[PDB]
Structure of Immunoglobulin G-binding protein G:
Amino acid sequence: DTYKLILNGXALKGETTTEAVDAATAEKVFKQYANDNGVDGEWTYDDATKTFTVTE
């Protein structure tokens, strides 16, 4: 299924997606995406909409 990540670094905000087999596998992809783009901090997950957020 399609999973979504909403990043908030502060000034820079964005949204990416990933096609993953389960929520844990999307989470791993998103965690390394966030780190590679300078956003590190507070995570959330909305199971009903397959949506993660990470906020600096």
